[PDB]
Amino acid sequence: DVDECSLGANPCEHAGKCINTLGSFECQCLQGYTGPRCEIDVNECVSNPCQNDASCLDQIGEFQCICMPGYEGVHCEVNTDECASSPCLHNGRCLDKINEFQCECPTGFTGHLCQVDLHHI
Ligand SMILES: [Ca+2]
Ligand SMILES: [Ca+2]
Ligand SMILES: [Ca+2]
Secondary structure, three states: OOOHHHOOOOOOOOOOEEEEEOOEEEEEOOOOEEOOOOOEEOOOOOOOOOOOOOEEEEEOOEEEEEOOOOEEOOOOOEEOOOOOOOOOOOOOEEEEOOOOEEEEOOOOEEOOOOOEEOOOO
């Protein structure tokens, strides 16, 4: 027949590589594109990749997750460790929460960070 890849413009959309065949042609699409002529912008959010109630952004050849507060990572799969800096004073036990921490203060200590000494009273 004809070499559709040699007529002038690339018959493959979105800079796909045109490969000639006898009787037709084929397109080798760049990441994020699909269809016989790469016409379609793939929806990278279609498989629900964003975890923990994150918002998914469908972009060119990728998705981006917008995490709920307290979450991080590409899929918002990481619950940020708020206990990392050891915030509890006087032997308080740190419990990691969502965008927060809890200190389990020993007897005689109170306050968010176990700051208040009550032993003298
Ligand atoms: Ca052809
Ligand atoms: Ca896309
Ligand atoms: Ca946390």
